[PDB]
Amino acid sequence: LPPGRLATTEDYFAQQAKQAVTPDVMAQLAYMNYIDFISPFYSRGCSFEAWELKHTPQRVIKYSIAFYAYGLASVALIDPKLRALAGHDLDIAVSKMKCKRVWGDWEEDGFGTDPIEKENIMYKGHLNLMYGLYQLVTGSRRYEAEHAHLTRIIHDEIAANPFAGIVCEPDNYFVQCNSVAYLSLWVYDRLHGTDYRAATRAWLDFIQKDLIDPERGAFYLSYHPESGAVKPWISAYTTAWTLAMVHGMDPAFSERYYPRFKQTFVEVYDEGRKARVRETAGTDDADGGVGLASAFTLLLAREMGDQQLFDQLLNHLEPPAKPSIVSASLRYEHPGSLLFDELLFLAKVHAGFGALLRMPPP
Amino acid sequence: LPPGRLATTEDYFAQQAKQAVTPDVMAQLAYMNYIDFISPFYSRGCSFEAWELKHTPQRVIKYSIAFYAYGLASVALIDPKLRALAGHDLDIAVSKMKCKRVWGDWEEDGFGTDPIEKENIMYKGHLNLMYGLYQLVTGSRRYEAEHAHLTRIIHDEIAANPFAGIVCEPDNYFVQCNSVAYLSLWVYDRLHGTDYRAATRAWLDFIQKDLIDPERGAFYLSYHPESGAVKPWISAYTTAWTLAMVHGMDPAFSERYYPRFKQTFVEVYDEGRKARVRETAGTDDADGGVGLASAFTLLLAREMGDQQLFDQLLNHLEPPAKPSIVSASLRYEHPGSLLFDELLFLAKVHAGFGALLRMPPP
Amino acid sequence: LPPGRLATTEDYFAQQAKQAVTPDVMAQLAYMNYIDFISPFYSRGCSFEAWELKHTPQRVIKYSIAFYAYGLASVALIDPKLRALAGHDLDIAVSKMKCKRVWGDWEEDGFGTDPIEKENIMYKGHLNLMYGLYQLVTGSRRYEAEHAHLTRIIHDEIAANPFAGIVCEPDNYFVQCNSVAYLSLWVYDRLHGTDYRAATRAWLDFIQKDLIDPERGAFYLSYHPESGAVKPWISAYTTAWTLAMVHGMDPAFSERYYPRFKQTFVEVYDEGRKARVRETAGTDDADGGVGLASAFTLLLAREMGDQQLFDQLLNHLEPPAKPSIVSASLRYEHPGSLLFDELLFLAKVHAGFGALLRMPPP
Amino acid sequence: PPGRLATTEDYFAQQAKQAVTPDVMAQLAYMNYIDFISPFYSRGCSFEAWELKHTPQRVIKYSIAFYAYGLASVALIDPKLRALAGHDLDIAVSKMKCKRVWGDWEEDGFGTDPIEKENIMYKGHLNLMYGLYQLVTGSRRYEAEHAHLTRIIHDEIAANPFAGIVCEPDNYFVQCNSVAYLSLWVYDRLHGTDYRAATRAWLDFIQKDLIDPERGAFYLSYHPESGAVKPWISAYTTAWTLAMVHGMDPAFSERYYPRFKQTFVEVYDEGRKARVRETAGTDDADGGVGLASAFTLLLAREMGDQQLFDQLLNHLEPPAKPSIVSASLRYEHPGSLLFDELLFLAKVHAGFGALLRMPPP
């Protein structure tokens, strides 16, 4: 057990075989569920006290809820005795995700009154994937009508666009936001026997043209269809997130680029015991930009089964954040980034996006 | 009298036989009633200055008023010369309980504009019990119409549900919130000769299935009917509160579990002179979560007639809170939790929920 | 003479015979009248800058204006050359008293949109007495219509109630608030030759039943007609205020209780040179509760002609408040209570409520 | 002297030299130079300059008026600055009409129209400013408004049993009336009318219960409903009133000026400095509103008393720590409200009589 760590990499990777979460993951689920009013998964209502207490910026709440939801789906697969709890939490995740506090930036920015009708794939990609994971975990048809409606909007918008995929803000295309939307089509197809996922091949061909640097195994920050502009910086957090989700749909795609991604961005230090991730090229600084390169690489390492890099990144991320378990509930005194407990939770439990797609019924 | 204690456990337990409150309980009633504008029981108006001055969070004000009300009902039973004052204070408790500042979280959370119509048993359970205790103490029919209306809503909601009882927020079931609602039906029946309390047996059978760990004498945190999920943590404050109220309706039920509850949660320390209560299993930490395990166990100890545990808990709770009596009014310099003066007041005077049910008329 | 005092007790009691206020009272009138915009008696407008600068709580502004008004009425009787100024200041006192900033707490508490129509005798008792004193001082009929309307409301409400008098907040009866309303009926009768004051005898009989402890010469805090409750604490500030005003209507009543009041509450200390007043029984602490026991006893001492107690209380109250006269205007650096300059001003000039009733015309 | 920017001789010579002192030019730079935040940047209802100096809302109307009276003297001092002074007066009038400036009248509950009746504090200044604008520029931009407000003031004087007009209802101030009467003299100069004929009855009225003739000092205020005169004399009230009256009846101010100085003015530091007591029965300087010394500085200028001017400016300016940065004047520690406004005005003031006789452009 390296210093400041709560459990071994071996323990996190063995959770599924043992059909039990580690005590520190159970303590994270207690933070998420235990205390009246202030725990994030206390109620379906439009209360965001848990996010106010952690100082989550408004624009990031949608990602907070989504990453918690993706983690809860893996908890359901790990421990059958926690599947009902995971289902309950996903029900709350979907309700909170639909509150105006979460999507309202779309209206305040002047882009429209309806966050699903067009564009805004950042928000509605996550919502659509969450509808699907909720139904895979619980077998409940509570959101089926909404799920079918949003899936058809995403399919129709892909069919209408001359580029493969959907924009976020108008004229802003991000590969990582698209990767969530495409994965949501795979989940819908698993539930209903449809073929919405057939659009995936053209998308994977499109993002391998001007959106990737194939030598570095790295995606450019964004694409802008009106001007044809690709922003000339590569992004580690963008790439780590995209390759993790793509691995669930086309494993060979992520396997091809993963080693080049690591060469481009990953700095091993402290005699092989630790790693930290550079956000872009032409710098020695770790975790610049949004500051999430290391945390998303931790998720990618888990998705790809790379125990060594997982261990190195968690040795960098967790100890300085000063975890403590008080009354069987996990707190970090010094979270090192946005989405800190969310992304460490997700990476600790993640079963692979492929395994979530094949989740047995309840 | 140990240092920082204001009176002996023997003195608190003798109050009913002597037909007099201890001087420190009288000084608590002075805090509650004495100073113009800022005392909590100054006026019927929707002024919450007393709660603003002690920094009571909005969501907790409803519990503050309720616990004061339950204490005042016991004062009425202890000293006939204080019964009119207790009645006046209960009148104010009911008026304040109906102010939007108290119930308004129900609307802000997006659950509805009417706090009584459906669900919300946390709020309307306390309100219904308060209507009843007011009428037991005073004989006044001021709230009788409202009391009948809310009692019929609670009866109809119980009859309609496939599980025994009523949810708080939608799909959130709490045993402690239900225990208040069921006790309110016993009080209505005492006033009117009805049999709304007949629903209690099915409820006591239901909460002894998946909602209790019978070996540990401990209720799980909550139940979620849509998913069938029971949150997998046991809760001391939940159990202490529920067993205290159930003792008034089915004494044998609470007698069965009380010894197991104490084994599971109660830590005796300082050579038997003190006790503190763990909030959940798998921790040594006292008073985690909402931080009320010890304070609600103090009430349960009083309800069960356990003088030794009462003395031990009050020796833990009161001295560090630094009580002082200035101008015959009680203040705590360092309240150790939410609802601190409310729950110590209640535990000091509590005559048993059974004895409140049999309160002689005015 | 004594250290930190501005003038001798002999000087304050001689003001009427010399037909001149002391220099320190003139300096108080300068604080009240001198500086543009920020002096309290600058204009009729709904500007409360003077009260914002002293941090007067909203609920206390009505008492601030009233006590200033009662002092100004005595200034009119002391110095005929200041009677026109006193009249001008009383005109402003009445205008400001009618501003929503002053009465608005009645609406915000949820008791109604009209502060005069019913109850609220705290506010409308003072207003009615102020209408009367304004007309006694000036001979002006400016407010005569309003005065007749409010006097008739007070008379009708007394006639309708089964207890003698009127409540403040609904179901809250205070003897001190009633004493102001009854005195306002004596002033109306002195202006118009009516007999509204005939209701006084039944009131004086009523407050000598459960509302007084006749052995201790002390009124209980309050009465609550719905429940029949009398709060079981005696109050010095309540008693001092009530006996001062009653002395103007039934001198024998206040003469009977005054010596017992002093025995119950007044602590003489520092070898007979100083006095301070306990607010309630069963304490050694001075000036608890609202903190006005000593200041209202100073007024009562003046009303009863007790120079020794006046001198003792002013030796306690004034020196620690650190009076300073700058540019012929009085300021206190450390006022010891609410209504500090108001009540010291009033006690220094007070000619007796009886003498204000027989105030000869201009 | 140390902390002074220029000699008393220099300020009093400005008109003869047809040039403002460099420090007065630096004050005009503070007033005019920086985009958005200078007080005379635009006609708009922007009050950034006043927010930055923490001017209380109720004082902004006096700030604008005193700047305007100074700008009228700048126009008389330097013909090359007359167009600038005219532009600044145009802005002064526009800003004076913004609700931020007059709005206290409505918020206090006295009415929605600040001109219709009473409120002579506000509308006296506005009327004098309309007149000075037209004397400086020859522009008829505000002529209609000027005629309307002049007729309101004349009609209200004619209707009142006391000589003049109240501020807040039942509050009569001699200093506020003195501005209104002077505005009638300016209207008469522009149009050949005789609105100023009302002045004699006013000067007779204020010499009854409103003045202590032995001390040369006005009482604080008069209250017609009650007949009350507040029993304190006021230096700032007297200094302001005598300065403005000197422009209409020089003999009146000449009669009282020496008694005023005996009553209120303390010479100290071996004759080099002076400070002014606000009322009688105190040794404290600059109590009450804290403007006794600043208004006495203006009165000293109006009466041609160079010695007292020098003494007061030696008291007022050095502790305020003037600095000129990039040819613009700032005070680090202004000692009162209206500080840069009243020092500006006193430094340039040509006399209210000379403003009345301003030659056309």
Added chain:
Amino acid sequence: AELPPGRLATTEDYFAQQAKQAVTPDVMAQLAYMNYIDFISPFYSRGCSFEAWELKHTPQRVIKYSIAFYAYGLASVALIDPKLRALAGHDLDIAVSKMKCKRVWGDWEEDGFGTDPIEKENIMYKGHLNLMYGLYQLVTGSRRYEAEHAHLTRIIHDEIAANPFAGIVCEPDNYFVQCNSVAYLSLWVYDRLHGTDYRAATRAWLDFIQKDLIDPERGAFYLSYHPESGAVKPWISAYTTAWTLAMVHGMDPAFSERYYPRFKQTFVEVYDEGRKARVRETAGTDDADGGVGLASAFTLLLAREMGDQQLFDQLLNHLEPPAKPSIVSASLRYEHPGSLLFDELLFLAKVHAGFGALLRMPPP
């Protein structure tokens, strides 16, 4: 040659960017500040979000100038590096969208001047908007804003034709030469795109501003003109002059060439043995960068426009080092920006190709 201390690149490097068809690494790091981080970078989205400006504490009234100066810099980036032209175009698209948000123009309404910021006057706002419409279309060839561009160009032309003085006021009765210079340049850009002759109005404007608005001996414009009163504020302004001469150089090079040497004599202080320069804002002071505090920053732009490498080097040696630039994760930040519009004006001066060269920008 040598890199002076605290500077990021040599004057020679900035002036060679066009010939090398590449921006310096520090200009690329400025474009990364402008474009890189989600939500908080100024050119993240078309939306009415101003987080980037809230984080730098930009006063509301200055946001319109911030966007405009970024836009003028981006136009030169498009001319420097063809591989960045599409990015420059995308950023200009966002600049135009943000420029139309009420947060940017709203001061016009709050000041009480009207509910429509374009209909009349307000030439400081609508001059920049009109020039930005034109630069967007020169860079991208996109007709997205063409209708709006034609509408605003005709408003500006009609208002010039209607006024007895040459040009348009900002606030009513406030005339500024620098604000007019932007509007006139916007007519030259429209003419380049459409073959029209709206720019013919320029000659009468250049004749007008050489009467009472300039001190021809000192090569310096007066602060402002006020048509109602005929008043010219009697102070000369360096930032006013530097800005006006830079833009006029694109329309009448001989005009700016005539006054530039006199401007430098009047305002520019060379110090530290010829290595540094700082600019006095007005006459009759030794203090540098008084008033709005932008004399030196606008003189840096003018030096670039006039091809004066020596003065450019001296001013940048004064401005940049004390601001403490650092490049973190390939993005430029200043720890102590010395003025308003600091990163905007240094960015612009570093890339500026000349307003004449932007007018002749080849198509994509």
